[PDB]
Amino acid sequence: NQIDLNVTCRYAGVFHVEKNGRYSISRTEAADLCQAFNSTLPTMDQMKLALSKGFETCRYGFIEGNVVIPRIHPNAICAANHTGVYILVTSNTSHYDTYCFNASAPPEEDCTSVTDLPNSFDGPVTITIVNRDGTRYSKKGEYRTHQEDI
């Protein structure tokens, strides 16, 4: 019973979370996952400020109200060469990665590793936070509150 959560640098408190190395998070699980990091789904304004501080990914993820990819550099295989906060318009499917926003994080780029999952609850899952530099933090718990996400 294990969940891997790959996380990024934070940019103005915004960061990306990928579960189990695949697009696999529903919108309800995304809100619960951010809550386990004392975080919320970013607003579009919070994501735009994070982009202006240097944040970009090549993965679709939830924010409040939309599924997006923040892009700084045009790349043909990431949001079809667009820059800015690219918004997904048409898709058949419902599972993506998520973005999260922590108001207590530093105001600009924070590329230190994540070393805690502060607001997970009691549970039986081994949850492992995996940083881009490979460093890991594991704890036994749960974060999902909706049965259909388990």
Ligand X SMILES: CC(C)c1ccc(CN2CCC(O)CC2)cc1
Task: Report if residue 142 touches ligand X, rule: CB under 6 A.
Answer: yes
Task: Report if residue 54 touches ligand X, rule: CB under 6 A.
Answer: no
List 94's β-bridge partners, or say none. none
Site for ligand X in 81-140 (CB under 6 A): 121-124
| Closest approach of ligand X to the CB of residue 150, in Å | 9
How does DSSP assign 45-105, residue by residue? HHHHHHHHTT---SS-EE-SSSEEEEESS-BTTBGGG--EEEEP---S---BEEEEE-TTS
As annotated, the binding site includes: 22, 59-60, 86
Task: Report if residue 64 touches ligand X, rule: CB under 6 A.
Answer: no
Closest to ligand X by CB, 90 vs 147, is 147
Task: Give the number of residues in contact with ligand X, rule: CB under 6 A.
Answer: 5
Closest to ligand X by CB, 122 vs 148, is 122
As annotated, the binding site for hyaluronan includes: 22, 59-60, 86
Cβ burial 55-83 (10 Å sphere, 16+ → b, else e): bbbebbbbbbebbbbbbeeeeeebbeeee
Closest to ligand X by CB, 54 vs 123, is 123
d(CA 38, CA 102): 7
Binding region for ligand X (CB under 6 A):
121-124, 142
